[PDB]
Scaffold this motif. Structure first.
Motif, PDB file in Angstrom:
ATOM      1  N   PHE A  34      38.854  21.788  58.300  1.00 56.07           N
ATOM      2  CA  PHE A  34      39.137  21.678  59.728  1.00 56.07           C
ATOM      3  C   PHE A  34      39.066  20.221  60.163  1.00 56.07           C
ATOM      4  O   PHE A  34      38.187  19.477  59.727  1.00 56.07           O
ATOM      5  N   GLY A  35      40.004  19.814  61.013  1.00 58.82           N
ATOM      6  CA  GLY A  35      40.013  18.451  61.512  1.00 58.82           C
ATOM      7  C   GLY A  35      39.484  18.425  62.936  1.00 58.82           C
ATOM      8  O   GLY A  35      38.629  19.240  63.301  1.00 58.82           O
ATOM      9  N   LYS A  36      39.994  17.503  63.746  1.00 60.76           N
ATOM     10  CA  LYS A  36      39.567  17.394  65.139  1.00 60.76           C
ATOM     11  C   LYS A  36      39.920  18.684  65.876  1.00 60.76           C
ATOM     12  O   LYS A  36      40.953  19.295  65.605  1.00 60.76           O
ATOM     13  N   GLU A  57      48.319  15.471  64.202  1.00 67.95           N
ATOM     14  CA  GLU A  57      47.529  14.551  63.389  1.00 67.95           C
ATOM     15  C   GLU A  57      46.730  15.256  62.296  1.00 67.95           C
ATOM     16  O   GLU A  57      46.587  14.722  61.192  1.00 67.95           O
ATOM     17  N   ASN A  58      46.207  16.443  62.592  1.00 67.66           N
ATOM     18  CA  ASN A  58      45.447  17.197  61.591  1.00 67.66           C
ATOM     19  C   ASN A  58      46.361  17.718  60.484  1.00 67.66           C
ATOM     20  O   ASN A  58      46.134  17.459  59.299  1.00 67.66           O
ATOM     21  N   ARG A  75      47.620  15.536  57.833  1.00 66.23           N
ATOM     22  CA  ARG A  75      46.660  15.209  56.785  1.00 66.23           C
ATOM     23  C   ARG A  75      46.168  16.449  56.030  1.00 66.23           C
ATOM     24  O   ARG A  75      45.163  16.395  55.317  1.00 66.23           O
ATOM     25  N   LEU A 123      44.989  19.239  57.332  1.00 63.05           N
ATOM     26  CA  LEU A 123      43.808  19.833  57.954  1.00 63.05           C
ATOM     27  C   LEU A 123      44.128  20.947  58.950  1.00 63.05           C
ATOM     28  O   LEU A 123      45.199  20.961  59.553  1.00 63.05           O
ATOM     29  N   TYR A 150      33.605  18.512  68.785  1.00 69.57           N
ATOM     30  CA  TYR A 150      35.062  18.556  68.661  1.00 69.57           C
ATOM     31  C   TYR A 150      35.601  17.278  68.027  1.00 69.57           C
ATOM     32  O   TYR A 150      36.742  17.247  67.566  1.00 69.57           O
ATOM     33  N   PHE A 192      34.450  15.854  65.300  1.00 71.84           N
ATOM     34  CA  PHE A 192      34.279  15.801  63.859  1.00 71.84           C
ATOM     35  C   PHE A 192      35.628  16.038  63.215  1.00 71.84           C
ATOM     36  O   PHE A 192      36.426  16.837  63.703  1.00 71.84           O
TER      37      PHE A 192
END
Ligand SMILES: Nc1ncnc2c1ncn2[C@@H]1O[C@H](CSCC[C@H](N)C(=O)O)[C@@H](O)[C@H]1O
Ligand code: NA
Lengths: 265, 265
Positions: free
Chosen positions: A130-132, A154-155, A158, A160, B128, B130
């Motif tokens: 998991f990303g932001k 953005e996640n 990458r 994510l 949020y 991270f």
């Protein structure tokens, strides 16, 4: 002289931990807030009966503007509890409340409980991927916020996953459904055209996490956008490329189309 | 004929949710594993006493290679519980076990519990914010894992915080400390020289979350690398760009150097 931040967990009155319950029972005063989220599988009456203490509910203003005039004064000569859905200090502004306690000479301790941040692990998606995270908010008047769309982009870029919280009007008890979130994202896509969220995007919907019978569904937007996921709250997740094991879980447990075993891996 | 995956929580036997305890108490057979994490405030004896059942502890091999031969057979004619530290599906490969259950015609349910993944909230860092998470693994022989360094780099460039789970070798009773993780990271920095982790890097350490008095410390690597953070388990966090209130909490609650109050926006 002590303030306890105690989480209530995910869904019903039994989602509080044994530690949280026992400590809450020993507190002279018990406060709670349900503006950050509601406990859809229970009621204030049931929570009160379980804890065996009258629970004083606080509004967003009560907490954000007057925590030090409402809760802290009592915490100076008594043991006081402040109950919140999920895990304490997850809500963005809650950590600061511990600074207020310190400034008031009040000791504070945190009693954890399950949070959606970790509960989404039930979707079979690896937690480390998991990303932001972001929240999908309703456009209003001349305001059309779209930052959550950029977060997904953005996640995913990458590899994510993106955890998406859906808008909630606590007091009005109004929730944004996963369906509404999908429709909104498609509209944002039409404007951004970044190829981030389309009818072919694979998504995962988690409803009523914490319940013994949560709704876990995975599939393409074109197929899930009008599907009935049951009663709220709903959580939407836009996964990044999947590890084959995540894909298998989604197919076997979340009813995802076998197509994802080659399209999204 | 059901199988329950029940989390026991962060630190001691009371970190289990009421739901988990009520269900565990009525199960015919109870299995558990304690190799995915460390519950520093309890013992098998205290857990058995709470649930009122004898608990058969399984090794990583028993689970990974024989879950379907040891646990699943009993779930066909009885109610079985499988206990784990924290939340059963977070940073473990336990989710895949639900697939094995389904293939054996066994229904499974998941009871969440507080997880280190959401407990990070107590550090004051907005959860949020991270990004991708990673695990600092112990080098083995000539094999020196380093991908966790790249994760930090990736998140940092995006201004996101990085959660670093630390290694554990339960059969050797080895639990990686934040100090050991910092030493390894400095070594990777020497090799890669990406300016990602140096003595001037701000880090946050959270030890024994779930206890009433966990160790929460923030500061520069040069100052914390040899500091005693108490008994394991520990997690290390490398924050990205800080919000004003995040910095304030780190200084007021985690004892960070007052100089971090200043943020270079
Ligand atoms: N109470 C605790 N305090 C600090 N770190 C903890 C912790 N519990 C787990 N961890 C961290 O996470 C690693 C185990 S990873 C497994 C996590 C577990 N399923 C959960 O939900 O928490 C440990 O090696 C340690 O680095
Ligand atoms: Na996250």
């Amino acid at each position: 002289m002590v303030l306890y931040f105690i989480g209530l967990g995910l869904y019903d009155e039994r989602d509080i931990t044994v530690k949280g319950l026992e400590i809450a029972k020993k507190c002279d005063y018990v406060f709670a807030e349900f503006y950050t989220s509601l406990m859809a599988g229970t009621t204030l009456g049931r929570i009160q009966k379980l804890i065996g203490k009258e629970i004083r509910v606080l509004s967003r203003e009560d907490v954000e503007l007057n925590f030090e005039n409402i809760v802290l004064p009592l915490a100076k000569e008594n043991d006081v509890a402040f109950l919140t859905p999920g895990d304490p200090l997850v809500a963005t502004t809650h950590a600061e409340l511990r600074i207020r306690a310190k400034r008031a000479g009040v000791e504070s301790y945190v009693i954890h409980a399950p949070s959606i941040y970790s509960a989404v692990g039930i979707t079979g998606l690896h937690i480390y991927k998991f990303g932001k995270s972001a929240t999908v908010a309703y456009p209003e008047g001349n305001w059309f916020p779209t930052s959550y769309y950029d977060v997904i982009k953005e996640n995913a870029e990458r590899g994510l996953h993106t955890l998406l919280f859906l808008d909630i009007k606590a007091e009005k008890r109004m929730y944004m459904t996963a369906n509404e979130a999908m429709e909104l994202l498609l509209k944002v896509e039409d404007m951004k055209k970044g190829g981030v969220f389309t009818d072919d995007t694979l998504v995962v919907v988690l409803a009523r996490a914490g319940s013994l019978n949560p709704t876990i569904r995975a599939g393409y937007v074109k197929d899930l956008i009008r599907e009935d996921f049951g009663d709220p709250p709903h959580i939407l997740i836009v996964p990044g490329k999947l590890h084959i094991v995540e894909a298998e879980y989604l197919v076997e447990i979340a009813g995802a189309p076998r197509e994802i075993l080659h399209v999204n891996v």
